[PDB]
Amino acid sequence: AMGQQVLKFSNEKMEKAVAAYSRELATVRAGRASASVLDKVQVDYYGAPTPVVQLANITVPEARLLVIQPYDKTSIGDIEKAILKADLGLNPSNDGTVIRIAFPALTEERRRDLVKVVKKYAEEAKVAVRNVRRDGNDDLKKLEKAGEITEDDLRGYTEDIQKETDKYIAKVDEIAKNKEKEIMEV
Ligand SMILES: [Cl-]
Ligand SMILES: [Cl-]
């Protein structure tokens, strides 16, 4: 039926709201490790002062750790030399293929502010999931009036949508809780 259709389409709209939420949380970090931390760091690469970023793939696998994997591994030594000179208060390690910099966690104060941010996004996401429910309930009410759906179906598919709304509201909460824990406990 087109009800099945509205449910699938609605479940997808909800899944997209969760995706957007998770994206927002991707930048909410508990440590000082961040790519931006190397913005004004330049290395003479082939007699050309070029930004670290342009010479390496920068990642932050865990709160307290910045990892820099250069495209030209022979440039490691010069990249660490440039980071020490930056004097950001960083003691770079070297793997032979990757450079690693330890960074402390954010202050606990900044940390509790980020939890607030996690909740703004948590609440924004729930509003989006609720709008999907409304939009879907509306699209069912119409399908029923158009004669695509029966009354028996309008109640069934309405309940169905309500159930998923609760599933995705729970999902958002779960994500928020995990993110908050992640942030406060290290
Ligand atoms: Cl990353
Ligand atoms: Cl409604």
Swiss-Prot record:
It is found in: Cytoplasm. GO terms for biological process: translational termination. Keywords: Cytoplasm, Protein biosynthesis. CDD domains: RRF. It holds the Pfam family RRF. The keyword Cytoplasm applies. One of its GO terms (molecular function) is ribosomal large subunit binding. GO terms for cellular component: cytoplasm. Its main location: cytoplasm. Coiled coil: none annotated. Responsible for the release of ribosomes from messenger RNA at the termination of protein biosynthesis. May increase the efficiency of translation by recycling ribosomes from one round of translation to another. Belongs to the RRF family. This is Ribosome-recycling factor. The lineage of its organism: Bacteria, Bacillati, Bacillota, Bacilli, Bacillales.
